Ligand binder design. Structure first.
Ligand SMILES: [Ca+2]
Length: 458
């Protein structure tokens, strides 16, 4: 029955987007890095994983054999338009995740050997689906058990509108129907019919098979492999940001906040000596907050930063851009347990008044969005980095920065010191699932990780 199936959709999405995908995207967003004394995530850190590494095979199966199949069954089993609306929104989000990883995705033929549609085709289709499902709402309430919004239809509408905001911006910055999507995005923000709170699955317990999936994999089935990465530490330390203490531990060697250069683990050991670059010399990622931590689909902070971006870029409305910016920073301060301390940066290093040009203001928005997605929604962080290209890629190599840290601009990304990409640069996509290669001859030919997804054109 639909009631028994519908909860599995978001559970399955959460397992992927909050677990395996969240994990590798945090390396690509340069929040964290491989602890010196272990090797579990070397190939993610150094961009040396390949299609055979199967880095997203589990997530692909749980998204398509799990979440999307469950959504198909709900849509077959209920006429309740509000339930169909929520289901269609989750279905759209699953496709959005997949497209943001491999660009192409099974869609028109999904759910044998389906063809993989182009990501632009998928974005267009799922947006049309949300539109149609919304228009079919008749005012009656939901019937399915809804751990995300407790059957609150206005919230599901807000989620749909936030996903529209996210995806319209990607058309705009892909220069695809940019004029049209700009008008749609301006209207969306003017209507201000977004969600309150965060969009999250929040039922995780510190018990066997009930923990947050990222915590479960990395702190229970593994010993902790994550240390903080140099860009995040540098930026939080530079901006005097008290959120440096949330999810990041001071070094045991000296009680300092220390981030490892991306892909730089083996080089630190080489340059400094292996005995002088141990786990105690770098900031651990703190797993103690993770066991019961929700899985995020859409944070309020991100939503506000996207609204701020729209006001700054398309309305030329500085006052509403500042309000949404500060709202975003304020919300993230609250979620991390620092409510009321947001002025430490809103009246300090990251004050809107201190930014003069639109570029300076957009940098604030983009940098503060990136901070807010750390330990919340890494997949989205990696996507927003790819779309906006902010934080900017440092002009200096990891070795140059290690040799003379004064050249570095805190918060800029750093191409991994060891970098398996033949072209160098940042990771632009994930490989096609190996299971798809083995079972579906229509799976697009593999391309290097430097080949961008369709909406990433610069
Ligand atoms: Ca880009």
């Amino acid at each position: 029955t639909a009631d028994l199936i519908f909860p599995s959709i978001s559970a399955s999405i959460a397992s992927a987007v909050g677990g395996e995908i969240y994990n590798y995207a945090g390396f690509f967003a340069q929040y964290y890095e491989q602890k010196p004394e272990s090797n579990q995530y070397n190939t993610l850190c150094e961009y040396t994983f390949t299609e055979s590494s199967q880095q997203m095979d589990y997530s692909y199966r749980i998204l398509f054999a799990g979440a999307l199949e469950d959504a198909k069954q709900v849509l077959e089993k209920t006429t309740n338009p509000a339930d169909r609306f929520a289901t269609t929104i989750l279905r759209a989000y699953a496709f959005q995740i997949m497209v943001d990883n491999t660009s192409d995705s099974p869609y028109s033929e999904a759910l044998a050997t389906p063809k993989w549609d182009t990501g632009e085709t998928v974005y267009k289709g799922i947006l049309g689906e949300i539109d149609a499902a919304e228009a079919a709402l008749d005012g009656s309430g939901m019937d399915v058990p809804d751990l995300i919004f407790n059957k609150n239809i206005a919230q599901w509408k807000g989620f749909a509108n936030a996903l529209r905001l996210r995806m319209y911006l990607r058309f705009i910055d892909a220069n695809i129907d940019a004029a049209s999507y700009t008008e749609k995005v301006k209207t969306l923000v003017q209507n201000n019919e977004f969600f309150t709170g965060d969009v999250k699955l929040d039922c995780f317990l510190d018990e066997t098979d009930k923990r947050n999936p990222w915590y479960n994999t990395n702190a229970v089935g593994l010993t902790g492999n994550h240390c903080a990465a140099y860009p995040l530490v540098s930026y939080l330390s530079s901006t005097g940001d008290p959120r440096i203490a949330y999810g990041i531990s001071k070094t045991d060697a000296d009680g300092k906040y220390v981030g490892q250069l991306p892909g730089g683990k083996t080089h630190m050991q080489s340059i400094l000596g292996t005995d002088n670059w141990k786990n105690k010399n770098v900031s651990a990622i703190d797993y103690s907050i993770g066991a019961t931590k929700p899985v995020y689909f859409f944070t309020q902070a991100e939503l506000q930063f996207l609204i701020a971006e729209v006001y700054a870029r398309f309305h030329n409305d500085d006052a509403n851009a500042k309000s949404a910016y500060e709202a975003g920073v304020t919300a993230d301060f609250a979620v991390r347990g620092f409510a009321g301390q947001e002025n430490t940066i809103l009246e300090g290093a990251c004050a809107w008044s201190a930014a003069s040009t639109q570029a300076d203001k957009l940098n604030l928005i983009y940098m503060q969005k990136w901070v807010s997605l750390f330990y919340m929604d890494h997949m989205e962080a990696w996507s927003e980095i790819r779309r906006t290209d902010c934080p900017k890629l440092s002009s200096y190599s990891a070795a140059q920065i290690q040799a003379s840290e004064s050249v570095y601009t805190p918060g800029e990304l750093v191409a991994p010191w060891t970098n398996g990409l033949e072209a160098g640069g940042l990771m632009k996509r994930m490989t096609y699932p190996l299971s798809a290669r083995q079972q579906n001859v229509n799976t697009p030919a593999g391309v290097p990780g430097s080949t961008p997804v369709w909406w990433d054109i610069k």
